[PDB]
Amino acid sequence: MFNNEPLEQIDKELHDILADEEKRQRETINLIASENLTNGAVRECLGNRVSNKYSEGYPKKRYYGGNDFIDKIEELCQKRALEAFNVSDEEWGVNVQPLSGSAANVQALYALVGVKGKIMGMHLCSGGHLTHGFFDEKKKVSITSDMFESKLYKCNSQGYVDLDAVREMALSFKPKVIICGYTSYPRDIDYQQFRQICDEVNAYLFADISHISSFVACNILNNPFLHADVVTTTTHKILRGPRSALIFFNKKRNPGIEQKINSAVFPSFQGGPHNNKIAAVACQLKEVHSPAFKEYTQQVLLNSKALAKALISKQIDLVTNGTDNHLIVVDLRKFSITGSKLQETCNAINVSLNKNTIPSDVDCVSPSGVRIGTPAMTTRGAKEKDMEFIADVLARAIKITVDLQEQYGKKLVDFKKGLPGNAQLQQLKQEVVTWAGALPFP
Amino acid sequence: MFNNEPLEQIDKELHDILADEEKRQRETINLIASENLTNGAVRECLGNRVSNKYSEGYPKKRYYGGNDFIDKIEELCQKRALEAFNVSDEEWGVNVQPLSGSAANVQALYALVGVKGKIMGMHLCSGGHLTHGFFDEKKKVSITSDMFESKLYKCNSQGYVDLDAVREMALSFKPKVIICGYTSYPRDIDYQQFRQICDEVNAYLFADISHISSFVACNILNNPFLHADVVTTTTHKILRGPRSALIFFNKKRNPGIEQKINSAVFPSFQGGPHNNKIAAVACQLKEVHSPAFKEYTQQVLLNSKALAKALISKQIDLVTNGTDNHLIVVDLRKFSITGSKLQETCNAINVSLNKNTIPSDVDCVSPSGVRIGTPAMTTRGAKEKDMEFIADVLARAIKITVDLQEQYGKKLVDFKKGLPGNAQLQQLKQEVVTWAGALPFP
Ligand SMILES: Nc1nc(=O)c2c([nH]1)NC[C@@H](CNc1ccc(C(=O)N[C@@H](CCC(=O)O)C(=O)O)cc1)N2C=O
Ligand SMILES: Nc1nc(=O)c2c([nH]1)NC[C@@H](CNc1ccc(C(=O)N[C@@H](CCC(=O)O)C(=O)O)cc1)N2C=O
Ligand SMILES: Cc1ncc(COP(=O)(O)O)c(/C=N/[C@H](CO)C(=O)O)c1O
Ligand SMILES: Cc1ncc(COP(=O)(O)O)c(/C=N/[C@H](CO)C(=O)O)c1O
Numbered sequence: 001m002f003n004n005e006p007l008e009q010i011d012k013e014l015h016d017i018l019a020d021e022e023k024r025q026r027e028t029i030n031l032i033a034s035e036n037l038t039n040g041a042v043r044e045c046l047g048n049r050v051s052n053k054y055s056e057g058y059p060k061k062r063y064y065g066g067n068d069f070i071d072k073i074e075e076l077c078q079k080r081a082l083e084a085f086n087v088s089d090e091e092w093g094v095n096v097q098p099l100s101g102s103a104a105n106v107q108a109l110y111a112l113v114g115v116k117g118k119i120m121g122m123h124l125c126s127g128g129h130l131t132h133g134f135f136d137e138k139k140k141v142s143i144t145s146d147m148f149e150s151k152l153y154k155c156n157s158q159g160y161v162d163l164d165a166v167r168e169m170a171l172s173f174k175p176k177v178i179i180c181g182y183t184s185y186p187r188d189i190d191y192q193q194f195r196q197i198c199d200e201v202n203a204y205l206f207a208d209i210s211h212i213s214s215f216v217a218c219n220i221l222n223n224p225f226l227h228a229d230v231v232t233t234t235t236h237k238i239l240r241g242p243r244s245a246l247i248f249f250n251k252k253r254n255p256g257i258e259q260k261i262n263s264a265v266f267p268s269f270q271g272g273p274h275n276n277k278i279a280a281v282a283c284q285l286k287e288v289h290s291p292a293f294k295e296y297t298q299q300v301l302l303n304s305k306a307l308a309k310a311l312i313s314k315q316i317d318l319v320t321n322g323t324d325n326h327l328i329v330v331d332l333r334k335f336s337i338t339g340s341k342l343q344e345t346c347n348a349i350n351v352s353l354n355k356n357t358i359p360s361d362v363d364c365v366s367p368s369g370v371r372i373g374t375p376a377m378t379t380r381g382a383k384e385k386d387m388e389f390i391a392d393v394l395a396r397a398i399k400i401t402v403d404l405q406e407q408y409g410k411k412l413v414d415f416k417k418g419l420p421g422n423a424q425l426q427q428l429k430q431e432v433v434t435w436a437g438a439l440p441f442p
Numbered sequence: 443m444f445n446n447e448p449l450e451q452i453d454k455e456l457h458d459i460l461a462d463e464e465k466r467q468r469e470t471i472n473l474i475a476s477e478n479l480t481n482g483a484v485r486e487c488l489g490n491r492v493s494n495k496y497s498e499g500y501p502k503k504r505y506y507g508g509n510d511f512i513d514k515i516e517e518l519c520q521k522r523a524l525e526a527f528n529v530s531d532e533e534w535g536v537n538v539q540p541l542s543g544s545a546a547n548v549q550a551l552y553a554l555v556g557v558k559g560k561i562m563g564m565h566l567c568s569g570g571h572l573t574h575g576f577f578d579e580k581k582k583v584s585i586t587s588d589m590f591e592s593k594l595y596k597c598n599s600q601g602y603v604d605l606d607a608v609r610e611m612a613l614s615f616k617p618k619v620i621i622c623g624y625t626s627y628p629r630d631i632d633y634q635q636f637r638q639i640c641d642e643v644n645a646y647l648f649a650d651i652s653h654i655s656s657f658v659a660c661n662i663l664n665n666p667f668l669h670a671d672v673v674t675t676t677t678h679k680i681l682r683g684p685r686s687a688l689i690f691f692n693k694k695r696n697p698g699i700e701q702k703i704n705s706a707v708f709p710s711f712q713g714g715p716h717n718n719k720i721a722a723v724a725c726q727l728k729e730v731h732s733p734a735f736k737e738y739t740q741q742v743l744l745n746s747k748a749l750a751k752a753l754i755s756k757q758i759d760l761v762t763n764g765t766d767n768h769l770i771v772v773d774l775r776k777f778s779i780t781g782s783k784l785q786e787t788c789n790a791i792n793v794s795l796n797k798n799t800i801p802s803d804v805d806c807v808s809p810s811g812v813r814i815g816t817p818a819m820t821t822r823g824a825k826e827k828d829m830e831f832i833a834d835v836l837a838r839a840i841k842i843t844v845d846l847q848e849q850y851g852k853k854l855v856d857f858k859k860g861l862p863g864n865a866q867l868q869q870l871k872q873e874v875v876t877w878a879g880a881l882p883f884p
Contacts, residue, residue, distance in 0.1 A: 001738050001823050002682075002884045003729065007483040011725050014487075014518065018721065021492050021511040028508060037444070037494055044449040045456075046718065047489025050463050051685055052479055064474060064796050065789035069463040076456065099541040102713035115557070115588055130709050143710045146557050147589055240444075243493055243716050267572050268585045271544040274685050276488065279460065286453050287445060296443050347507040354506045379444055442444050 024350075027437045029390060031346075031353040033184070033327040033373025034211065036240045037380070038284075039442045045280035046242055054272045058262060070275055077278050080285035081246055084217050087225050093258050095247040096281060097265050097273040101210050101234035104245035105131035106143060108230050111257075111264035112204050113176045119148045120170060120203075121179040125357040125364060126155040129183040129208065151175065157359045159319040159329070163190065167197050174201055181208035181224065181231075184356055184371050188212075188221045188324040195227035204254075210234040210245075212325050214297040214375075217288055221325065229253055230261075238300065238326055238375045241284035244277045296378065300326050303374040306384040310391035316398070319358055319369060327373040329356050330394075337401050339370040341415055345401040348419045350432045351393065366412070380439040393432060400424055466792075469879040471832060472822075473795040475626070475769040475815025476653065478682045479822065480726075481884045487722035488684055496714045500704060512717055519720050522727035523688055526659050529667050533694040538686075538723060539707045539715045543652050543676035546687035547573035547621075548585060550672050553699075553706035554646050555618045557589055562612060562645075563621040564603070565594040567799040567806060571625040571650065593617065599801045601761040601771070602629065609639050616643055623650035623666065623673075626798055626813050630654075630663050630766040637669035646696075652676040652687075654767055656817075660736040662743060663767065671696055672703075680742065680768055680817045683726035686719040738820065742768050745816040748826040752833035758840070761800055761811065769815040772836075773800050779843050781812040783857055787843045788812075790861045791871040792878065793835065808854070822881040835874060842866050 008015045025037075038046075050073070057063045059071040077096045082089050098104035109119060109131075121132025121144075128134065130142040133150025140146035151173045156162040161180070170178060180194050191207060198205045207224035213233040215221035224231055231248040235241035247265070249257045266273075287293055308323050317331040332339060339355030346353050356371040357364060374382075377390070404418040419425065450457050467479075492512065498505045501513040516538060523536045540546035551561060551573075563574025563586075570576070572584040575592030582588035593615045598604045603622070612620060622636050633649060640647045649666035655675040657663035666673055673690040677683035689707070691699045708715070729735050750765045753772065761771040774781060781797030788795050798813040799806060819832070846860035861867065 001741060002479070002481050002821055002882070003483075003734070004481055004884055005483065007486040007725065010481075010483045011728055014515070014721065014724055014728075017511050017514050017518070018487075018490055018492055021495070021515075024508065024511060025491060025494060030508075032496055032506065035494060035496055038491070039444050039452075040446050041449040041452045043489040043491070045460075045489075046493070047485040047487075048460055049467060049480070049485070050460060051485075051488070052467060052477060053463070054474060054477055064794065065785060066466060066470065066794045069459050069466055072459050073456070073463075076459070099545070100713055100716070102711065103541070103545070106711070110585070130713065141709055143552070146710070243714070243718075267576075267583055268588075269544065269548070271542060271572065272685075274542070276685075279456065282456055283449065283453050286456075292443075292445070299443065343507060352506065352508045381443060440444070442446050 026441050027433045028350045028352055029393065029432055029436050030376040031351060031372040032376065033371050034237045035376045036237060037376060037442050038240065038242060041283050042242055042280045045283050046276050048276050048279055050279050051274060051276035053275055055275055056266060056272045073275065073279055073282060077282040077285065080282055080289070084285045084288045085225060085248065086217065086219070087248070091250065091252045092225070093249050093251055095261055095265050096278055097270060098245040098247060099270065099274060099277070100243060101232070101245045102131045103269065104232045104247050105129070105208065107264045107269050108206070108232055108247050108261060109144060109148060109177060110268065111260040112230065113148060115147050117148050118173065118175040119144070119150050119177040119179065120173065120175045121150060121152060122161070122182055123152040123154050125361065126359070127182040127185040128152065128179070132179045132208070155359055159359050160187065161189070163193055163197070170197050170201050170203070175203050177204045177206050179206040179208060181210070181212070183211065184327065184329060186318070186320050186323045186325065186327055186329055189224070191222055191224045191227040204229040207231045208233070210237055211327065212238065214238040214288070214300070215325060218294040218297045220297060220301060229257070235281050235284065238297070239284065239288065240375070240379065242277055242280035244281055299383070300374050300378045302384050303378050303382060303387055304328065306387035307372070307374060307391060310387050311394065314391060314395045316395065326375055327371060329358065330370050330372065331358050332368050332370070332398070333360070335398055335402055337398070337405055339367045340412060341401050341405060342370050342397065344416055344419060345397045348422070348425045349393070349397055349429050350436065351397065380441065382439065389435065393428065396428060468883050469875045470792045470794055471835065471874055471878050472818040473793060473814040473832070474818065475813050476679045477794070477818045478679060479818060479884050480682065480684060484684055484722050484725050487725050488718050490718050490721055492721055493716060493718035495717050497717060498708060498714050515717065515721055515724060519724040519727065522724060522731065526727050526730040527667060527690065528659070529690070533692065534667070535691050535693055535700045535703070537689045537704055537707050538720055539712060540687040540689060541712065541716060541719070542685060543674065543687045544573045545711065546674045546689050547571070547650060549706045549711050550648065550674055550689050550703065551586060551590060551619060552710065553702045554648070554672065555590060559590050560615065560617040561586070561590050561592045561619045561621065562595060562615065562617045563592065564624055565596050567803065568597040568801070569624040569626040570594070570621070574621045574650070597801055601801050603631070605632065605635050605639070609642070612639050612643050612645065617645050619646045619648050621648045621650060623652070623654070625653065626769070626771060628760070628762050628765040628767060628769050628771055631666070633664055633666045633669040646671045648672045648674070650674045652679055653769065654680065656680040656730070656739040656742070657767060659730055660739045662739060671699070677723050677726065680739070681726065681730065682817070682821065684719055684722035686723055741825070742817050742820045744826055745820050745824060745829055746770065748829035749814070749816060749833055752829050753836070756833060756837045758837065768817055769813060771798050771800065772812045772814065774810050774812070774840070775802070777840055777844055779840070779847055781809045782854055783843050783847065784812050784840065786858055786861060787839050787846070790867045791835070791839060792874045793839065822883065824881065831877065835870065838870055
C-alpha cells in the first residue's frame with residue numbers, strides 16, 4: 001500500500017530543483033574549505049533500507065531485537081574508524097552515532113564536564129567553531145556557552161594561536177576542558193603544548209580535527225591521538241564521508257570515560273541512530289585506510305601550497321603568510337574591500353568561497369578576509385598546475401570587486417547592485433563554467 | 443581522483459550485510475510501533491548529491507552563497523509541512539532543520555524555558571519519551587532532566603493520563619512547559635484539558651505527536667494545533683518519511699517565538715543542515731497531503747482495531763482494553779510471563795515487537811507487556827483479515843513462552859537456552875517467513 005514511482009514521476013517539482021543543484025555543483029569552482037564530493041558508494045549507503053531500523057542502544061546491548069545485521073554494521077564502522085586513525089582498540093574507543101559535528105561536540109563536552117561545567121575554546125573570529133563555547137556581549141550564541149561556562153582565547157595579530165595567552169587564561173579560569181582544533185585555521189597545531197597546559201591545571205584535552213581529519217589519518221600533520229583525551233571529527237569534510245560525526249576517547253588515560261561518552265550520546269542526547277549514516281561511514285572509512293586516499297590527501301596539500309604560492313606571486317596577502325593544511329585565508333585590507341563583497345563577486349562567477357575574520361577585524365559583519373580550501377577541487381581532479389588558473393580567477397575577481405566598489409560605493413546594498421549585467425563577470429563566469437563543467441564529477 | 447565503482451565492488455563486505463538486512467526486513471512481521479518502510483523516492487532523496495552543500499542559516503539568510511536551489515528546497519519543505527498539518531502561513535511557523543525527534547524536543551524546550559527552566563512530561567514507564575524530562579533515582583538519564591528542571595506525571599492504574607494528577611502537580615511545581623503526546627500510549631489525548639491546565643499556571647503547551655502524526659494530519663484524531671503553542675513530530679514513524687523531525691510553533695499566540703525557536707536550532711544547537719533529509723521530507727510531505735495517504739492512515743487504524751479485537755477474542759488482555767490509534771499494549775500478567783521473554787520468543791520467529799511497562803510495573807527492567815503497532819505491516823499491504831493471523835501468531839508465541847518458562851525457569855538467561863532448535867518455533871518462523879517474505883515490499 002505504497003507509491004513506488006521514481007522520484008521523477010512522483011515529485012517532478014523537486015526532481016527539477018535537485019537536477020538544477022547537481023548542475024550548479026558540476027559547474028562551480030568550489031573553494032568552501034569544509035565541502036567535498038561524496039562518491040556513488042557512499043550515496044548508495046545513505047539511500048539504503050537500513051534506515052528503516054530502530055537501533056537505540058549499542059551493539060550486543062540493543063533495546064529491541066532483530067538488530068544483528070545492524071550490530072555488525074556498527075561494529076565494522078567502529079573498527080574501520082580505529083584503524084583509519086591508526087589507534088589500537090585497547091587504548092582508544094569510538095562512538096559512531098552522533099548525527100553531526102555540532103551534536104558530537106556538545107555530547108562529548110557534556111560527558112566530560114556536565115551542566116555548569118567549565119570549558120575553553122578558540123573564539124569564532126579567530127577560527128574556532130560555534131560548539132567551542134561561542135558567545136558575544138549580548139547573547140549566549142551556542143548552547144556550549146549556555147549549558148557550560150565558557151572562555152574564549154584569541155589568535156595573535158599574526159593569526160597564530162597565542163599559546164601564552166591560552167595559559168594566562170587557563171590558570172586564571174581553571175577549566176575542565178580545553179578545546180583546540182578549528183574551523184578556519186591555516187596552520188598545524190601544537191597539541192603537545194596544549195597537553196602541557198592541560199596537565200598544569202588538571203583539565204581534559206579536547207581536539208576537534210574535523211577540517212584536518214585526513215591529515216591526521218595519513219600522518220601528514222601532527223597526530224593529536226598522542227596527547228588528547230577526546231578527539232572529535234565530522235566525517236563529511238576533508239574525510240569525504242557522509243554528514244556524520246565521530247567521538248574518540250582515550251581509555252588508557254581515563255577509564256570509565258567510555259561509559260560517560262556512550263551514555264551522553266544515548267540516552268542523554270540522541271535516540272535511535274541513523275543506520276544509513278553509519279553504513280555510509282563504514283564505506284568511506286575503508287577508502288580512508290587505502291593508499292589511494294593518502295595519495296588524495298597529499299594532493300590536497302600540494303594544491304593548497306601551489307595555490308598559496310600562486311596567490312602570493314600576484315601580490316595577495318594570506319593570514320600567517322601561507323598554509324600547512326588544506327586552507328588559506330586571504331587578507332584583503334590592501335585592496336580596501338571586505339570579504340563580504342568578494343563572496344558576492346565570486347558567487348556571480350560560480351566560485352564558492354566564504355568571508356572570514358582576520359585578526360585586525362573587531363566584528364564578524366563585514367570581515368576583511370575570505371576562506372578557501374582545496375579538498376573539493378582536488379576530488380574533481382585539479383593538479384598543482386590548475387592552481388595558477390584558480391589564483392588567476394581570484395585576482396581577476398578581486399580587481400572587479402575593487403572596480404565595482406569604486407563605481408557604486410562601499411555600502412553592501414549599493415555594491416551588490418553592480419553585479420548583474422557586468423560584461424567582465426559574464427566573460428569570467430563562462431571561463432569558470434567551461435573549465436569546471438568538464439572536470440571529473442562523482 | 444575518487445573511486446566511483448558500485449558499492450558491490452568497492453566494499454563487498456558491507457554490501458553483504460546490507461543485502462542480509464534487506465532480507466530480514468522482507469521476511470519479518472514488523473510490529474514495532476515506531477517503524478515504517480520508506481519508498482524508493484524518499485531513498486533517492488537521501489542518496490542525492492544535495493548533501494554536499496553547506497547551508498548554515500535559513501532561506502534568504504544563508505552564511506554562504508550558491509544556496510539558491512537549497513533555499514528553494516527548504517521553502518518547499520516548510521510549505522508542504524504547514525499544508526499537510528492544515529495550518530496557515532500566518533498562524534504557524536515550522537523549522538525543518540532538526541536532525542531527529544530527540545534533537546527537536548531538546549531544541550524546542552530550550553527555546554521555551556532556557557537552562558535551569560521547568561518542564562513537566564509523562565514518565566517513560568507510563569509512555570512518555572526520554573526527551574520529556576526523564577530521570578530516575580540514581581541518574582538524570584536524559585539531558586532534558588539535567589539541562590532543565592523536570593517533574594514526571596504518571597498514567598493511572600488503568601493506563602490513562604490522570605488529568606487530576608497533572609493539574610495537582612502543575613500547581614505545586616509551577617512549570618513553564620507541559621509536554622503531552624507520547625511514545626507508548628494507545629489512546630487519543632485531551633489537549634483541550636491540557637490547554638486549560640497550562641493556562642491556570644501560565645505555561646506553554648508542547649505536543650509531541652511523533653507516534654500519531656498521520657492521525658493529526660488526516661483529521662482522524664484530536665487536532666493539537668488548536669490548543670498547542672509548540673507541536674513536534676518525527677518524520678519517520680507513522681508519517682513514513684526519512685529520519686528527521688519538525689518543530690511547529692504558534693506565532694499568532696506567542697509573537698517572537700519564531701525567532702526563539704529558529705535560533706535554538708541554529709546556531710544554539712545544530713550546525714549545517716542535512717539537505718538530503720530536508721529534500722526527503724519534502725518528497726514525503728507531498729505524499730502526506732494526497733487523499734491516498736489518508737486512505738493508508740485509515741487502514742492503519744482499521745488494522746489496529748481488528749488486531750485489538752482479535753487479541754481480545756483469544757482472551758489476551760490489552761492496557762486500556764483497546765486502542766484509539768495505531769498501537770496496542772498487551773498486558774501479560776494472566777500468563778505469568780514478562781515482555782522481555784515474549785520479545786525473545788518473537789525474535790526467534792521473525793516477529794519484531796518490544797517489551798513495554800504496564801501501570802502495575804515498578805521498573806523498566808523485566809516489564810509485564812509488549813507494544814505492537816500496525817503502520818509497517820499496513821505499508822506492506824496487510825488488511826483487516828490478516829490481523830487474525832498476526833493475532834494467532836502472537837497467541838501461539840505467548841503459549842510457547844509459557845511452556846519454555848515452565849521447562850527452564852524464570853531467569854531470562856535460562857529461558858533463552860530454550861529458543862534455538864525448538865520444533866514449534868521453527869514451524870512458526872517458517873509460517874511467518876512464508877507469509878511475510880511474499881508481501882509487497884518498497
Ligand atoms: N571560524 C568559523 N567558525 C564557525 O563556527 C563558522 C565559520 N567560521 N563560518 C561560518 C559560520 C556561521 N556561523 C555563525 C553563527 C553565528 C554568528 C554570530 O555572530 N551570531 C549572531 C548573529 C549576528 C547577527 O545577525 O546579529 C547571533 O546573535 O546569533 C556568526 C557565525 N560558522 C559555522 O557555523
Ligand atoms: N515510552 C517509551 N519511551 C522511550 O523513550 C522509549 C520506549 N518507550 N521504548 C524503548 C526505549 C529505550 N529507551 C530507554 C532508555 C533508557 C532507559 C533507562 O532506564 N536508562 C538507564 C538504564 C538503567 C537500567 O537499565 O537499570 C540509564 O541509566 O541509562 C530506559 C529506556 N525508548 C526509546 O528511547
Ligand atoms: C571544527 C568543526 N567542528 C564542528 C563543525 C560542525 O559540524 P556539523 O556542521 O554540525 O556537522 C565544523 C564545521 N564548521 C563550518 C560549518 O559550519 C565549516 O567549516 O564551514 C567544524 O569546522
Ligand atoms: C514521542 C517521541 N519523540 C521523540 C522520539 C525520538 O525520535 P528520534 O529517535 O530521536 O528520531 C520518539 C521515538 N521513540 C521510540 C524510539 O526512540 C519508539 O517509539 O520506538 C518518540 O516516540
